[model samples]
Target: MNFSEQQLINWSRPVSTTEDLKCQNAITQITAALRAKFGNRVTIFLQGSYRNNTNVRQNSDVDIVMRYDDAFYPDLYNFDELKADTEEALRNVFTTSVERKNKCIQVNGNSNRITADVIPCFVLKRFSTLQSVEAEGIKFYSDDNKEIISFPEQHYSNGTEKTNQTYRLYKRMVRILKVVNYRLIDDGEIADNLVSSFFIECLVYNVPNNQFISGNYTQTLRNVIVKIYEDMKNNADYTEVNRLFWLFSNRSPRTRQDALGFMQKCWNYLGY
Candidate 1:
């Protein structure tokens, strides 16, 4: 599949206002096509940066999960060929541009230069536990052939400063952000959860690196700041509350009143 200049540009951050809306429409059409063409043979799920809530940046790619239930495709590793063929069949069946493109599809219209990526991932059984099915992919993807995926620092605190706990906290924050983001989206306010997720990721990337914090993944703290920004950007009015909590909780506050206010905001949001 040939890619155009537009496709490359469409993959970058702070999703264009038009593009965001276009993506929602495109997913609707594409998912509908999947349901019709595959029937019960496959199911669609979402994962990756889109699911993590740390993708606060623009031009973020959307990850789609395609679970095949046929149980007959013997070779899972070589399944890409079948995936491609099925995608083509689905595309032919659907008149909309949402059909499976070679890798990703870009739909231009509605003033939203949106590109939708449809990825297929299979469920691998390990030890017979439902939760053991290929949990790691992308960030921590692992395989059954004794293969392990390692990040820059083998562990969160693998950096020189040895901030192991710090890195883990950052990942946890991302998971929490996703939960909150998902709740809000399900409430019908935001049609796509990726919007908030991407916003947060971009914000974290903006934190200034201080020379003092050696081997510091201060990026995680930046993530907290971005989380607050995302809440405020949506006009949610909880930004101030979160900002104070994230601020005072992470760093010592200048005044006692500031710290008090931070605690209050947490209670207000949680009420527990």
Candidate 2:
């Protein structure tokens, strides 16, 4: 159960160059097709791990957001309506099978052999107890019929800026944590999908910037892991990367207790 420094370093490696190229090409094709069909009605861009450039080799689902900017659908139509339209538009160009999921439309590519989750969204006004604005953010209803208010562009910018501030150690820690999560799940130490990849990114993001040293990936990993374990063990609530939302919301997948258990299990699983 012992792991060498080189083993951890290897696990921290980014996605393969060839795989990135294939994913890019697939995205390009899909975006072009969508643009031609919608004709400026919708804007397509990468959103999640792929957009943040923190994507690992273990997961390859390209997260694409297809936001229709012409109008808002919060009250006019339901998520199913927008999802159907988006999927149909994609089917027009992509011969590959398309499946509608709770959150996004999954476009299965044949040539690139990649799967992309196409999220449908529209601009909407956001209101707070303090004030209201004309354009607050983007809104999209999930497959579970739940509404989600997101600032994806801001999320991408924050991750990029944080990485730069930490001399790129932030993302390195993200990849390391992700690899550990994957290994833990595979070893049955954690349930599959219990900890999402994005949630892992946010977990690392909560670490103090000082802990992520430029050339000390091993220490960085150990410190961040210990910090998270301690925080959750003490029942301390964590703030999301945006600083607006709490990480352990009422609807969170993993509670504070759950996180502590997972971290404890992960520590034992990593043989540390």
Candidate 3:
């Protein structure tokens, strides 16, 4: 099967301005309300695809993190307490339904028609050998009853820099691959269970920055897919793009083998 450059380009387009405004306004409203209730005790900001500008048309959710400074609290508060308290606070401000999930408080917006995930967190830090303070990452609890530490700021920063380094082709390739992944799932060629947008983004991040330099979109896409697929097949595991974390554990659904298999199927499906 042959792929059309125009078709891929069309699919790679970002979300519309109207959609962006709605989500932006929604986050602004939530931030204001949270500040009113909590004062300077918490810091609120956008995270994930919306913040990084990698959001696609079908992405109906916005990620917002509300981090409470540890200095404000006297006791050693855990994530459970932070999440529960934040959920109640959001319920008071939004007329729509508020549900507490494993990691975030889901605020189902009425007019915006977009879901917002408000995550509660505490600032994590570490002392270096030089006795200087360094912000490590954010710490939160997972639904599986485990603590998870992630570097969202680093991920976002690196993604933006990589996009610039690749002449803005990195994100387009990510979007294109995402659309193709959706097609594969919709066509029953692959299970939607294993693949995620985050996983897809990370996979694209592994592609050598030089491969995305070709001005030819068609050739660049082919080279990127081929290079990543081959790499995953050869490597046993993948480190997170930040080099601070692992992409997947041995038992994860989105493991190196899973990515390799999906890439192989995707290549065959693309008939390249």
C-alpha displacement of 20 in model 1, angstroms?
Answer: 5.0
Per-residue lDDT of 1-272 in model 2, one digit per residue for the tens?
36777777777778733256668777887788677767776777777777777666743878888888766433226667777888888888875678878888888866564678888887756443222333255788887778877767766777788989997888887887777788787788778877877787777788889888777666777888888899887887676665556678775666777667767776776677
Predicted candidate 1 versus true structure: per-residue lDDT over 119-214, tens digit per residue: 554544322122233322222122222222212111112121222334434433433344435544566544452344433332332233231132
Better of 2 and 3 by lDDT: 3
Query: Which stretches in model 2 have alpha-carbon errors above 4 Å?
Result: 16-19, 72-78, 125-135
lDDT of each: 0.39, 0.74, 0.75
Question: Lowest-scoring 10 consecutive residues by lDDT in candidate 1?
Answer: 238-247
Check candidate 3 and list the clashing pairs.
none
Q: Which stretches of candidate 3 lie over 4 Å from their true place?
A: 16-19, 70-76, 126-135, 248-253
lDDT of 2 at 95: 55
Clashing pairs in 2: 102-143
